[PDB]
Ligand binder design. Structure first.
Ligand SMILES: Nc1ncnc2c1ncn2[C@@H]1O[C@H](COP(=O)(O)OP(=O)(O)OP(=O)(O)O)[C@@H](O)[C@H]1O
Ligand SMILES: Nc1ncnc2c1ncn2[C@@H]1O[C@H](COP(=O)(O)OP(=O)(O)OP(=O)(O)O)[C@@H](O)[C@H]1O
Ligand SMILES: Nc1ncnc2c1ncn2[C@@H]1O[C@H](COP(=O)(O)OP(=O)(O)OP(=O)(O)O)[C@@H](O)[C@H]1O
Ligand SMILES: [Mg+2]
Ligand SMILES: [Mg+2]
Ligand SMILES: [Mg+2]
Ligand SMILES: [Zn+2]
Lengths: 202, 349, 615
DNA sequence: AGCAGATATCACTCAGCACGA
DNA sequence: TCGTGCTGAGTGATATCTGCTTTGGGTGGGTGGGTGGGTTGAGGCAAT
């Protein structure tokens, strides 16, 4: 085809460094200029919170979701590409994109074998990682409902083709958005500019 | 044996008669009037149909640019204006002609269908409406009752005069060099003078621009015209065929075998002119054409169709067709004047 | 099997062939030298020139020893003469002059051991094609030679697929057309070698059909005698194979009659001619038209109807600088200097894309043309696509455009799926396929040329530029340069346009005579040279570009305060400016980027949109 | 044309006895 | 208890004849199946 003790020692030495936060923020996005706060938020999302498995309470999610909205001139897709390059697990997707595998699980036919196969979506494949959605603005209603379910229950349920199954989707989301027009108008509120439902944006 | 039933043999007497008739100054008027004697009026549309039948000269340049000699005609008007009857007449008179409807046709049925050969069991192509009518005329009725899916095929046909097929491992280009004559109705079903031309006709502007001439015909109520049309229709409806008694409803021997011009003679004339004449342009016709184009394009008066560089090509094509009408080897000032008059009537009425 | 008396004597023809091979001269004999080369393993293909045969016949007739017409006999029935010539060559093969490692070849050892076994048996054989190490082909009779000797050259006369009828079967004919399909090279078996587990002997089989039945039982003398039942097992090491390729040739457009569909004819390529035909090339394939009989139950069920193919034998393959280049791009159109310069900049596409930090600035100077009907958008598209080596013309194919400009017509009418495809092409420069059937990702660093019409068909001055454009604002922003073309009536311009068109129609040539257009070949090779070139920029020019950027940003913000502005300047506009400057430097053939190039790029940017909008 | 099932006519093994040794 | 035939019918065996069926395509069908292939075009339907 074309972790060791020393690695742990190096990790501990790096952690002992005083300016570790700034170092990690700089290392995440060397080519992006003057977005320290966004880089810090991205770093914190990458590390993620603690997953709690509660008896009597249920499940509390430790993931962090960040929305990157603003003018189109600024660098927003490069940040997503960097996050993909850094995250151990994740998938790149754009809403309403035929090239991408898809955001939701679906039942398909194996052309190769003429067999029925249940294929998992991008969100499912990102379990435990960061799923970057490049174009959040343009998206199907169905896809929006699936995103809401994933960000609410953290599982995807399908009851089609005679199959009743639930797939784990414990993954973080880092989406990007653009305004309705050629620019974001400061006078109007963010909800109007981004053109997304208040529920999904909250 | 296989006996064709398409090209009429020309005799020396027929050729001499054709030449003698062509030498008349008003040959164009007589020939235009001889088309569809049962249709009252529509003289300009008849002239346009005659010029379309005669057709221009097709020139292909060395660099690769291809200039078609076919003339396309579109008629948009109110109901009961003799558009369908004109289409039927041009279907009957033209040597090669194919009739299609808006709602009766499909994209595949127009271009070509992939099928299998019984004899050989080999995947092949079946010619469509467009293909079948190569070097002929295709009459499309109810042009506005179509679908965009279907419209795309036609758009490609007129724009390139060729058919491109990519199906079932078939990669080929089919020659489709046919003149398109079509009839359509306004969106409201009746032309409205107040509303602009764009609103009246729903067809795409790109598709519209390919038609050399656009004729807008409206049914106007006038006592004199109404009386004339009614009398003409009543006279036509009283016709009886030879060898038939009054009240009798209308029902081969061998195999090998200002006066109106009879249809067979018209067909012979058209064949002769389209076969043995290739008019060439001259300087005077060019001066007239450029003067007319400059005057029409930059003029305050509104036009039912926008002026464009395609109008210059349309003028040249009409001049060439009129030259063909007279059996003249060169395009003269008369041809340019006639083409300019026809275009001006079609544009500004 | 009733017999016929035909006026052909194959013995005399074989003598003729042997005499021609031995004696013909055109130093020593040409074909004797060719056979000597073949013996030393220097040549693996022998081509018989019918012109040589005709000349030899003419010389023999002149000398008074008139001989049979060999050219006509070869042309009328070429399948037999291939074998006849092979036999003649074998009977007169010269001894090798360069020592070779005989023991290396498996066939040599096997035949030597068969000879030893035969000698042992006597003390108490193989097909000729097996040992042949050459291929024989017939070169058609050239028209010039035939006319020199007062003869008709049927073989070399081009024919269409339709003109190839059933009466041409078994003859040497030429076909003119365009190759539409070529298959992969595969080994076709000619002689099969078997082995006996018990005997220890080798058996051989000749294949001259689509299908064959393998041997099962030993036929050796030893086996027969001893009554030993030994099974035969196929051995691919000692078998003989020949490269095989199947191609499809289709009729040219000018050859099809009126109201007819083109037809195709199969072609079979054997020996060293493989890989001589590729899709899309117009060729003059010379071969032997032969039938392909069926076998077994198919044969019985088919009937008398026969398939046909062509055995390929010969293949003939058919064939102030800025202002000058711009004017020579499309002489037939009325002068549009700025658009032509933009097209040159797109075509050359000079850029330095080596960031190495994870991404790299796009290396394509994309151009989009939008205007009301009447401008020669189609003509610019076709011309610029023709000149480009990788230019691809499509109507609303990307793979063919990889590392090259894409010529897209009717851009606005394109479907949304293709819009997303081109969006992926621009932002990511990658083509991705996600299907059950296959999953392949091909890189696509291809530029795009787009032609579109306004929303209403014609530009409306009242509406803002964004309103007239149906495409998403992001796509417009991503375009490096956007040129807006409009048709404004005017006496002078209309008169000149009409005069130009009329002159073109009459004289079928460019009316302009003030300047002589540059030759297209020179222009394309100059473009290639410029592409091969790599420029470089300094810090002072960088600071100048920064200053120009701040000025442009302020001006664009002030303009966008009103609704007339197409859009605010963005860092994408910067990157486009540097890309244009690098392309212009590549044009100049000077490594250092000069301030003049930056100023020219800025003026091009201004005149692409503002020049026409202000009008 | 090739393949699988079947018929029938082809030999070969153990069987055993008469002479004499 | 060895050697040499003569008898012999039994137990094979192998050299030797008698009937499908097939390709693929409706010149075998839909009480052989549609996951063994064909298969692009028109048509009607529901969710959109
Ligand atoms: N802070 C920054 N540092 C470096 N480059 C930047 C910065 N802000 C913007 N850019 C440049 O802006 C351009 C933005 O490109 P990018 O692919 O990120 O766009 P985008 O956010 O996807 O745009 P759109 O909304 O139009 O699709 C890139 O050339 C990037 O170099
Ligand atoms: N100028 C005319 N002279 C004689 N008959 C006419 C004339 N105009 C219309 N008609 C009569 O109209 C009848 C039907 O009209 P026709 O089918 O020709 O209309 P059309 O132009 O195709 O209109 P539409 O398709 O919109 O209804 C024909 O039988 C013809 O007799
Ligand atoms: N400057 C010009 N000089 C000469 N002929 C021209 C010129 N501009 C346009 N034409 C003519 O205009 C005719 C039609 O226009 P063309 O197809 O070239 O482009 P377009 O109008 O942009 O096309 P579309 O109608 O498909 O949007 C062409 O035959 C071409 O000959
Ligand atoms: Mg983006
Ligand atoms: Mg009608
Ligand atoms: Mg165009
Ligand atoms: Zn053997």
């Amino acid at each position: 085809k074309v972790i060791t003790d020393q690695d742990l020692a190096k990790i501990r030495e790096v952690a002992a460094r005083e300016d570790l936060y700034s170092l990690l923020a700089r290392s995440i996005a060397p080519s992006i200029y003057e977005l320290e706060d966004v880089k810090k938020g991205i770093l914190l999302q990458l590390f993620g919170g603690t997953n709690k498995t509660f008896t009597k309470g249920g499940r509390y999610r430790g993931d962090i979701n960040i929305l990157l909205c603003g003018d189109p001139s600024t660098s927003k897709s490069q940040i997503l590409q960097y996050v993909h390059k850094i995250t151990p697990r994740g998938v790149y997707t754009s809403g309403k994109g035929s090239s991408a595998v898809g955001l939701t699980a679906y039942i398909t036919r194996d052309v190769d074998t003429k067999q029925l196969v249940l294929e998992s979506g991008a969100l499912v494949l990102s379990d435990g990682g960061v799923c970057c959605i490049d174009e959040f603005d343009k998206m199907s209603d169905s896809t929006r409902s699936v995103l809401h379910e994933v960000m609410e229950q953290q599982t995807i349920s399908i009851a089609k083709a005679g199959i009743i199954t639930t797939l784990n989707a414990r993954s973080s989301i880092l989406a990007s958005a653009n305004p309705i027009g050629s620019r974001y108008n400061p006078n109007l509120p963010v909800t109007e500019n981004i053109d997304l439902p208040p529920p999904l944006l909250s | 044996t296989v006996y064709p039933l398409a090209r009429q043999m020309l005799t020396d007497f027929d050729i001499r008669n054709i030449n003698k008739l062509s030498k008349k100054k008003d040959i164009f008027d007589i020939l235009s009037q001889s088309l569809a004697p049962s249709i009252y009026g529509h003289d300009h549309i008849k002239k346009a149909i005659l010029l379309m039948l005669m057709g221009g000269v097709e020139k292909n340049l060395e660099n690769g640019s291809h200039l078609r000699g076919d003339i396309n005609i579109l008629m948009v008007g109110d109901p009961s204006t003799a558009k369908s009857q004109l289409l039927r007449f041009v279907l009957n008179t033209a040597s090669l002609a194919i009739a299609t409807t808006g709602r009766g046709s499909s994209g595949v049925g127009l271009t070509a269908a992939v099928t299998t050969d019984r004899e050989t069991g080999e995947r092949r192509l079946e010619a469509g409406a467009m293909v079948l009518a190569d070097r002929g005329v295709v009459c499309i009725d109810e042009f506005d009752k179509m679908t965009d899916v279907d419209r795309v095929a036609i758009h490609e046909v007129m724009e390139q005069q060729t058919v491109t097929i990519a199906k079932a491992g078939i990669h080929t280009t089919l020659n489709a060099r046919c003149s398109v004559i079509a009839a359509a109705n306004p969106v409201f079903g009746q032309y409205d003078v107040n509303r602009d031309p764009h609103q009246n006709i729903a067809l795409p502007d790109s598709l519209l621009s390919r038609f050399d001439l656009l004729f807008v015909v409206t049914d106007d109520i006038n006592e004199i015209r109404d009386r004339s049309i009614s009398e003409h229709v009543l006279r036509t409806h009283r016709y009886l065929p030879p060898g038939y008694l009054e009240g009798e409803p209308v029902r081969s021997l061998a195999v090998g075998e200002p006066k109106l011009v009879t249809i067979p003679f018209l067909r012979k004339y058209v064949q002769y002119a389209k076969e043995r004449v290739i008019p060439q342009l001259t300087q005077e016709a060019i001066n007239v054409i450029v003067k007319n184009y400059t005057d029409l394009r930059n003029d305050d008066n509104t036009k039912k169709s926008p002026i464009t560089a395609r109008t210059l090509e349309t003028l040249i094509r009409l001049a060439t067709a009129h030259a063909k009408v007279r059996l003249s080897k060169t395009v003269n000032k008369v041809d340019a004047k006639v083409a300019a008059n026809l275009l001006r009537f079609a544009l500004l009425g | 099997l009733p017999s016929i008396q035909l006026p052909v004597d194959y013995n005399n023809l074989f003598n003729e062939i042997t005499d021609f091979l031995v004696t013909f001269k055109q130093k020593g004999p040409k074909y004797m030298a060719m056979l000597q080369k073949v013996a030393n393993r220097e040549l693996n293909s022998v081509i018989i020139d019918l012109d040589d045969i005709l000349q030899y016949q003419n010389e023999k007739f002149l000398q008074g020893t008139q001989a049979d017409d060999l050219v006509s006999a070869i042309q009328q029935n070429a399948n037999h003469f291939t074998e006849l010539f092979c036999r003649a060559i074998d009977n007169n093969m010269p001894l090798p002059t360069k020592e070779i490692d005989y023991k290396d070849d498996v066939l040599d050892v096997i035949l030597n051991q068969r000879r030893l076994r035969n000698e042992r048996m006597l003390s108490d054989l193989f097909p000729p094609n097996l040992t042949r190490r050459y291929f024989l082909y017939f070169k058609p009779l050239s028209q010039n030679c035939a006319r020199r000797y007062r003869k008709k050259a049927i073989s070399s006369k081009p024919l269409s697929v339709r003109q190839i009828k059933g009466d041409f079967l078994g003859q040497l004919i030429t076909v003119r057309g365009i190759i539409t399909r070529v298959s992969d090279v595969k080994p076709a078996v000619e002689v099969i070698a078997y082995t006996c587990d018990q005997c220890g002997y080798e058996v051989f089989q000749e294949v001259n059909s689509r299908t064959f039945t393998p041997l099962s039982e030993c036929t050796s003398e030893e086996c027969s005698q001893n009554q030993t039942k030994g099974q035969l097992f196929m051995s691919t090491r000692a078998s003989k194979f020949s490269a095989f390729q199947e191609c499809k040739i289709q009729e040219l457009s000018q050859q099809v009659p009126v109201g007819h569909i083109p037809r195709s004819l199969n072609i079979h390529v054997n020996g060293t001619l493989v890989r001589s035909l590729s899709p899309g090339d117009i060729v003059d394939v010379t071969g032997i038209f032969l039938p392909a009989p069926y076998t077994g139950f198919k044969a019985l069920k088919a009937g008398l109807l026969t398939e046909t193919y062509l055995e390929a034998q010969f293949v003939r393959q058919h064939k102030d600088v800025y202002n000058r280049l711009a004017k020579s791009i499309a002489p037939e159109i009325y002068g549009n200097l700025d658009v032509k310069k933009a097209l040159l900049l797109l075509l050359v596409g000079g850029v330095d894309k080596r960031v190495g930090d994870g991404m790299k600035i796009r290396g394509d100077i994309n151009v989009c043309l939008m205007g009301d009907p009447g401008v020669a958008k189609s003509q610019l598209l076709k011309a610029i696509c023709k000149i480009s080596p990788r230019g691809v013309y499509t109507t609303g194919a990307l793979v063919l455009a990889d590392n090259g400009i894409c010529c897209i017509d009717e851009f606005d009418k394109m479907d949304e799926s293709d819009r997303t495809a081109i969006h992926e092409v621009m932002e990511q420069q990658t083509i991705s396929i996600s299907k059950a059937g296959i999953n392949t990702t091909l890189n696509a660093r291809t530029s795009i040329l787009a032609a579109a019409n306004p929303l209403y068909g014609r530009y409306n001055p009242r509406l803002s530029p964004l309103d007239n454009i149906n495409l998403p604002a992001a796509l417009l922003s991503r375009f490096d340069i956007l040129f807006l073309m409009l048709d404004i009536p005017s006496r002078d311009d209309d008169e000149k346009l009409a005069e130009h068109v009329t002159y073109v129609h009459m004289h079928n040539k460019q009316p302009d005579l003030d300047f002589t257009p540059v030759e297209p070949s020179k222009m394309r090779e100059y473009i290639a040279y410029a592409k091969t070139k790599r420029p470089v920029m300094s810090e002072a020019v960088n600071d100048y570009v920064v200053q120009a950027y701040i000025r442009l940003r302020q001006d664009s913000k002030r303009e966008m305060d009103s609704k007339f502005s197409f859009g605010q300047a963005t860092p994408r506009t910067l990157l486009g400016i540097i890309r244009l400057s690098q392309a212009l430097a590549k044009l100049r053939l000077a490594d250092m980027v000069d301030i003049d190039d930056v100023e020219e790029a800025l003026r091009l940017v201004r005149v692409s949109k503002e020049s026409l909008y202000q009008e």
